[PDB]
């Protein structure tokens, strides 16, 4: 079991309420079965990465008080690793490690494209239709066709390349020096690790994902990236932070959090990525 408690971090504070199950599907339960102490910070998706960082620091202060641990091990997905990086940069004594899983560490090309769409920047109507349809599909899969089909796109405003480049200028710690490289494993006494994935193979071979309507949507979005290797939301290169563990899983962005409800690609054991890593962290004296 880890020395320091594990804090799972993601955006969409309302997820569990709206969807009816956790964002990290099955993962905290699996970790606890392995003896680790585990908490989840579900951060505000519709605001900036610095607002989420501040929220996460308030949560961490409260958690450190309740545990008497001196530090935490963050495991973030998507928006999560940026808020984790804010806390590690500002409050390194409180952070043992930052593990980023498909983090939007250098921006999302699909957030960039939506911004070109939102602003009417000469994107053809057929592309607009396919992007909005894909977003709607994913939204409605999770919300049970309940509610608005675009609103939750507000989450991408803080994930554009422009916004994330600004964030990275403030919080450069552990980023790669060469695009597509790795960062330093230890920066200011904090350990940084990354995982990622990119969509691979023809859709008919996907197994469980053939029952998950979000997968084909992710595949539509994947086709609009300049970076070929992408998970539907973020390019493989953009995920990099600290030391690479593994990033060639054949998984879309939400497959990597075991979604929807354990429907993932190729019979891969997503939860095992996390439990194996928690053992690795414990092996590093974290
Ligand atoms: Ca899936």
Numbering used by the authors: 2 to 287
The authors write:
Previous studies of PML and its homologs have shown that this class of lipases exists in two conformations, an open conformation, and a closed conformation. Current PML structures have only been solved in closed conformations, even when bound covalently to a diethyl phosphonate (DEP) inhibitor.
As a consequence of the two mutations, helix α6 changes from an α-helix in PML to a 310 helix in PMLVG that orients its hydrophobic amino acids, particularly I154, into the substrate binding pocket and towards the DEP inhibitor. The net result is a constriction in the size of the substrate-binding channel. Notably, assuming that the closed conformation was active, the tighter binding pocket in PMLVG compared to wild-type PML would be consistent with the lower KM deduced from kinetics. Another structural difference between the PMLVG mutant and wild-type PML is the loop region connecting helices α5 and α6. This loop is visible in the PMLVG structure but absent in wild-type PML suggesting it is more disordered. Soluble PML and PMLVG had T50 values of 45.6 °C and 40.5 °C, respectively, suggesting that the I118V and/or E130G mutations destabilize PML in solution.
